[PDB]
Amino acid sequence: SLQRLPQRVELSAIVEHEAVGDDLSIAFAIGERHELGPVPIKLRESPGLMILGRQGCGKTTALVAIGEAVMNRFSPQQAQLTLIDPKTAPHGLRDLHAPGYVRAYAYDQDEIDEVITELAQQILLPRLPPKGLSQEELRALKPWEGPRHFVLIDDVQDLRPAQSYPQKPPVGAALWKLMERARQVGLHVFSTRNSANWATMPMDPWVKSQTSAKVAQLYMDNDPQNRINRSVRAQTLPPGRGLLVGADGDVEGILVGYPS
Ligand SMILES: Nc1ncnc2c1ncn2[C@@H]1O[C@H](COP(=O)(O)OP(=O)(O)OP(=O)(O)O)[C@@H](O)[C@H]1O
Ligand SMILES: [Mg+2]
Numbered sequence: 001s002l003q004r005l006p007q008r009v010e011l012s013a014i015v016e017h018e019a020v021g022d023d024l025s026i027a028f029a030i031g032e033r034h035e036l037g038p039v040p041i042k043l044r045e046s047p048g049l050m051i052l053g054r055q056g057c058g059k060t061t062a063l064v065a066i067g068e069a070v071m072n073r074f075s076p077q078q079a080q081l082t083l084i085d086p087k088t089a090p091h092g093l094r095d096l097h098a099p100g101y102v103r104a105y106a107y108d109q110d111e112i113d114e115v116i117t118e119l120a121q122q123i124l125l126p127r128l129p130p131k132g133l134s135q136e137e138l139r140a141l142k143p144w145e146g147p148r149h150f151v152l153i154d155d156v157q158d159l160r161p162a163q164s165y166p167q168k169p170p171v172g173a174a175l176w177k178l179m180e181r182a183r184q185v186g187l188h189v190f191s192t193r194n195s196a197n198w199a200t201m202p203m204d205p206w207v208k209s210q211t212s213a214k215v216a217q218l219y220m221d222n223d224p225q226n227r228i229n230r231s232v233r234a235q236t237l238p239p240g241r242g243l244l245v246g247a248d249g250d251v252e253g254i255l256v257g258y259p260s
Contacts, residue, residue, distance in 0.1 A: 011257030015072040028065040029254040047182045050210040052195035053220030058239040059192035060092040064259040076100035084153040120174035127185035153191040156206040176209040214247035
């Protein structure tokens with residue numbers, strides 16, 4: 001089937017429905033090819049999302065909705081939220097309230113760098129299998145324990161880049177290699193990026209890591225002259241709407257549910 005999407009849908013309708021196999025998925029939107037019901041993000045297949053859109057398209061709201069979807073699908077022992085918000089976006093991650101779920105929220109660039117590096121080096125790197133092990137030894141290793149870590153990164157274009165005099169690494173760069181290997185350490189990065197400059201957007205290292213990780217990418221409002229791939233062009237769209245594009249090339253028009 002292929003139905004047309006409403007102007008708006010409440011995220012609470014989406015959550016109450018998913019609630020009612022061996023699922024490892026969250027849902028924060030409805031889809032044209034899902035009979036206007038929830039579109040599950042299968043986290044074993046696509047452990048995160050890259051979200052690309054022009055101003056006003058609903059990048060920030062989508063992360064709020066994803067946060068709320070996480071909290072309704074998982075207990076705090078199963079999932080923790082790390083909130084990265086360099087623009088202190090109005091009505092954004094700063095207002096997502098959940099004690100027990102939020103292990104860190106930061107907006108200051110050095111603070112963000114600290115939070116991401118601590119998570120990557122103290123928590124996630126240990127979950128990787130040690131180097132210099134036989135494949136036989138690797139197959140019998142104990143799996144890591146603890147919660148899955150959902151890192152919500154708004155406005156990656158506003159993260160401070162690498163510099164010299166004084167030397168500083170790009171803010172949050174510690175996470176990039178673990179994002180490629182995210183399926184092994186239970187890391188789930190949902191990052192948004194302004195995409196008015198379609199031509200630099202592929203050079204953004206956050207986009208590179210997510211593409212290299214082969215996560216799905218959500219193309220919200222964009223210039224229809226721009227091409228997602230040989231077969232799919234970007235679309236101009238109202239807020240909350242986007243083209244969900246899998247690494248396999250599958251494409252769905254979706255509508256992000258409006259958060260509580
Ligand atoms: N899922 C949605 N459904 C309906 N309307 C939405 C949705 N998300 C956002 N909007 C509308 O779009 C407006 C801007 O949303 P938001 O601030 O999330 O966009 P943004 O892309 O993060 O903006 P910016 O590019 O300025 O950071 C909201 O105030 C709301 O009016
Ligand atoms: Mg925003």
